[PDB]
Amino acid sequence: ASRLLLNNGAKMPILGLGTWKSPPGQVTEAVKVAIDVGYRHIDCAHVYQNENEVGVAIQEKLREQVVKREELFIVSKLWCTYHEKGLVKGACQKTLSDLKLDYLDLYLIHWPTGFKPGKEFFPLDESGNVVPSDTNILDTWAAMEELVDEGLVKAIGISNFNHLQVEMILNKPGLKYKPAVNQIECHPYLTQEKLIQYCQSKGIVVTAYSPLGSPDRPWAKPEDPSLLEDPRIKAIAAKHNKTTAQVLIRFPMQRNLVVIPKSVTPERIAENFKVFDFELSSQDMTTLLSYNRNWRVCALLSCTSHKDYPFHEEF
Numbered sequence: 125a126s127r128l129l130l131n132n133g134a135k136m137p138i139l140g141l142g143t144w145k146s147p148p149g150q151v152t153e154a155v156k157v158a159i160d161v162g163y164r165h166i167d168c169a170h171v172y173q174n175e176n177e178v179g180v181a182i183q184e185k186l187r188e189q190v191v192k193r194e195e196l197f198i199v200s201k202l203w204c205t206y207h208e209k210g211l212v213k214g215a216c217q218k219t220l221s222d223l224k225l226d227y228l229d230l231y232l233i234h235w236p237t238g239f240k241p242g243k244e245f246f247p248l249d250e251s252g253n254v255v256p257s258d259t260n261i262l263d264t265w266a267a268m269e270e271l272v273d274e275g276l277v278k279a280i281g282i283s284n285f286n287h288l289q290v291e292m293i294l295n296k297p298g299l300k301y302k303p304a305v306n307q308i309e310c311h312p313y314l315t316q317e318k319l320i321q322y323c324q325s326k327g328i329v330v331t332a333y334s335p336l337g338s339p340d341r342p343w344a345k346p347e348d349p350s351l352l353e354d355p356r357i358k359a360i361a362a363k364h365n366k367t368t369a370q371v372l373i374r375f376p377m378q379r380n381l382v383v384i385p386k387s388v389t390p391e392r393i394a395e396n397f398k399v400f401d402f403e404l405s406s407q408d409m410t411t412l413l414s415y416n417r418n419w420r421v422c423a424l425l426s427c428t429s430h431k432d433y434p435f436h437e438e439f
């Protein structure tokens with residue numbers, strides 16, 4: 125399987141290139157190399173401040189006729205400060221302009237938490253806590269559905285939503301388009317078995333982010349767990365004659381998830397895409413699943429008091 129079918133009738137490439145932390149001066153090249161080596165899915169976000177440069181790469185590959193638009197699956201996300209109904213279209217249009225596209229294949233609500241609109245991505249009060257906005261995810265969802273009806277995005281989805289929050293949408297009175305995807309953190313240390321089973325049971329595709337444990341996360345404390353250096357995982361990689369990163373990318377692929385490893389290193393980009401020629405045994409799968417620790421790379425600690433903070437619930 126190269127792609128998964130979404131509840132909107134389209135197929136999403138199970139492997140995509142992530143761009144969080146991909147510096148503006150290296151991500152144009154990273155995306156160009158990725159398409160050249162076969163990637164057909166790019167994960168982006170206005171909050172990553174590098175969409176214009178990712179856009180250059182895409183436009184050049186289209187222009188060079190290396191790939192056609194219908195063959196690409198581009199994803200972006202609505203940042204928290206744009207949850208207000210009157211701000212969603214504008215945020216979507218800014219991202220389409222920076223990426224130089226006429227439509228997005230998928231547009232996601234980045235976080236269930238809406239913040240106060242303004243220039244600051246994380247507006248804080250005189251103590252730090254983020255200043256929420258009185259918008260609710262349901263109203264925000266309605267504005268997202270309007271983008272589909274306006275031709276701006278082909279599918280809409282969510283990210284970092286817990287199962288009760290997914291249920292909130294599925295239960296929205298008047299619900300017109302169900303979320304096609306829920307992109308959540310997923311790797312051997314945060315396996316997400318309940319939230320994934322819940323989503324798949326609802327026909328919602330799950331995209332696993334930080335599949336490698338985001339070793340380049342800014343808040344990395346060199347004492348923290350490290351997937352790429354876990355000997356149990358390297359032994360598994362060793363057995364299949366693959367790299368540990370290849371094992372970590374193949375792992376969610378076999379649980380029927382979409383996976384989006386990030387790299388701005390050409391050789392890594394190529395290496396990461398070489399995950400369709402081997403299979404992990406169900407025994408390897410269950411062993412990897414056993415390493416779960418409920419360890420999160422992205423906990424959004426600055427919003428633990430927000431009404432819609434997603435991680436107080438067990439899933």
Ligand SMILES: NC(=O)C1=CN([C@@H]2O[C@H](COP(=O)(O)OP(=O)(O)OC[C@H]3O[C@@H](n4cnc5c(N)ncnc54)[C@H](OP(=O)(O)O)[C@@H]3O)[C@@H](O)[C@H]2O)C=CC1
Nearest residue numbers: 142143144333334335336337338340369385386387388389
């Ligand atoms: N919805 C959300 O809230 C979130 C979405 N995401 C999405 O998921 C993507 C991927 O997750 P991310 O957090 O970036 O972290 P990843 O788990 O993808 O790991 C990226 C780090 O791993 C390194 N790496 C990549 N390939 C290899 C390799 N083969 N061997 C050794 N090291 C490697 C990269 O190095 P280098 O680049 O130097 O090669 C980088 O430092 C994000 O970029 C973003 O698109 C991420 C977080 C949150």
Ligand SMILES: N[C@@H](CCC(=O)N[C@@H](CS[C@@H](CC(=O)O)C(=O)O)C(=O)NCC(=O)O)C(=O)O
Nearest residue numbers: 144169171234245246343421422423424425426
């Ligand atoms: N991207 C943010 C980074 C600062 C931030 O607050 N990041 C959050 C979100 S992580 C990331 C998730 C993603 O990639 O979508 C993001 O949106 O920036 C975070 O890591 N919180 C846990 C903490 O208190 O340290 C920014 O600079 O605007």
